[PDB]
């Protein structure tokens, strides 16, 4: 994506009803800090999800260690809060060649103060004045009270610790809802007239697969015989009517 917002108004995208391309995530390998939870990153290729929350923002190259489920520091204190029990992956890389511009980048912002720690996954766009001391400023700025937000200072004159990271966070769950977003798997070349173990679409058995002229209705999957055996199946990748003997 071409434009991530800051952490005071981070973008959140509910994603479901599609398939996961988890391969090139690991094959990317241009990513600085790439960690995961729940169960191992190699294991998560197939172990799939009801409803994922993909929310992303841009933070500094020093504060990214604050982004960890159950830590402190400003981004996890007042800006964006990972929960106490978390599943997803933190994906983090540098975008110094895009974000930090000569003449100064000050598009980006963050919240520096709030009268409590931040509830998990809840943004804070309320840019009203907080009153640290007791003297009421009441919307306008003044004494004992500061402005809530502040920018970052990004230029390519910054050191490597001050480079902008485009942290995207993937968060996962599991419910009475089905695994609506789920990773695909590779196929096996069809064998005709060979005793061959098989799986089609999760249907499993062992038989001799042949070409067959029995004619399905389109929505259908299996055929069956009188005996409630699985007699004939249709190849999902190339539609064809395959007997099972």
């Amino acid at each position, epitope marked *: 994506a071409t434009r991530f917002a800051s952490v005071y108004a981070w973008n959140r995208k509910r994603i479901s009803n599609c398939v996961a391309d988890y391969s090139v995530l690991y094959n990317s*390998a241009s990513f600085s800090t790439f960690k995961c939870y729940g169960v191992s990153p190699t294991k998560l290729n197939d172990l799939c999800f009801t409803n994922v929350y993909a929310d992303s923002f841009v933070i500094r*190259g020093d504060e990214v260690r604050q982004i960890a489920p159950g830590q402190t520091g400003k981004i996890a204190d007042y800006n964006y809060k990972l929960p106490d029990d978390f599943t997803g992956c933190v994906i983090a890389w540098n975008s110094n060649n895009l974000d930090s511009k000569v003449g100064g980048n000050y598009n980006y912002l963050y919240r520096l103060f709030r009268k409590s720690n931040l509830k998990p996954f809840e943004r804070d766009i309320s840019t009203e004045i907080y009153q640290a001391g007791s003297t009421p400023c009441n919307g306008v700025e003044g004494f004992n009270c500061y402005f809530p937000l502040q920018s970052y200072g990004f230029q390519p004159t910054n050191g490597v610790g001050y480079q902008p990271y485009r942290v995207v966070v993937l968060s996962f769950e599991l419910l009475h809802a089905p695994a609506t977003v789920c990773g695909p798997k590779k196929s096996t070349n069809l064998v005709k007239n060979k005793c061959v173990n098989f799986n089609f679409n999760g249907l499993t058995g062992t038989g001799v697969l042949t070409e067959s002229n029995k004619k399905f209705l389109p929505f259908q999957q299996f055929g069956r015989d009188i005996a409630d055996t699985t007699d004939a199946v249709r190849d999902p990748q190339t539609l064809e009517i395959l007997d099972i003997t």
Partner: antibody
Amino acid sequence: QQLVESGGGVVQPGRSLRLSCAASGFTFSSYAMHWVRQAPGKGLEWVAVISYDGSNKYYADSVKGRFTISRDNSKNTLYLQMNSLRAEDTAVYYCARHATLMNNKDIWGQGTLVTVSS
Amino acid sequence: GDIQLTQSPSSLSASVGDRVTITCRASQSISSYLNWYQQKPGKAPKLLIYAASSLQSGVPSRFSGSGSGTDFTLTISSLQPEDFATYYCQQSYSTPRTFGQGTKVEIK
């Protein structure tokens, strides 16, 4: 628990000097062991491994002098012979171990000076 | 080729009660295989963090590690008068292992 080293000293270049380092408290045998180098004012530079649990020897190609490494497992001791010397290797050596996400066994010897000079 | 390390800064003269972030950057994407050491000059390197995110016996949480991939972080917090020494990061990803050049935290 504890690592002891063979004696360091001043050796002329091109020569050889076997390095002995004996363990105590727990055996060498079940683990690997390493050697590292510290020149004065210089960072800690890894030298070579030993791997007793099969048998394999890896050397740094940065200092690739065929500094040979093998065992005396029954004495919990390890031998790396200083071969093909050159003066910039004049430093202190350490017997080492790396916590490879599983163990916490990083135990370090006392440090002895190898000197390469005429 | 070899795996390059990048330890930054290579020194930082510090004061009492600080929170110093000694960064060890990597040339490749290393999973978590990075460590940290205490060395007063002439001592044995006392291990501080293993797998870049886990504390060690005898060493309280005034030290605190995090990071993965290329980016690794030494999170020294509430800087103590004994913590001023020469420190080191560490790969164990491939062979050869290299160590960082060291970061001497010292009294201002």
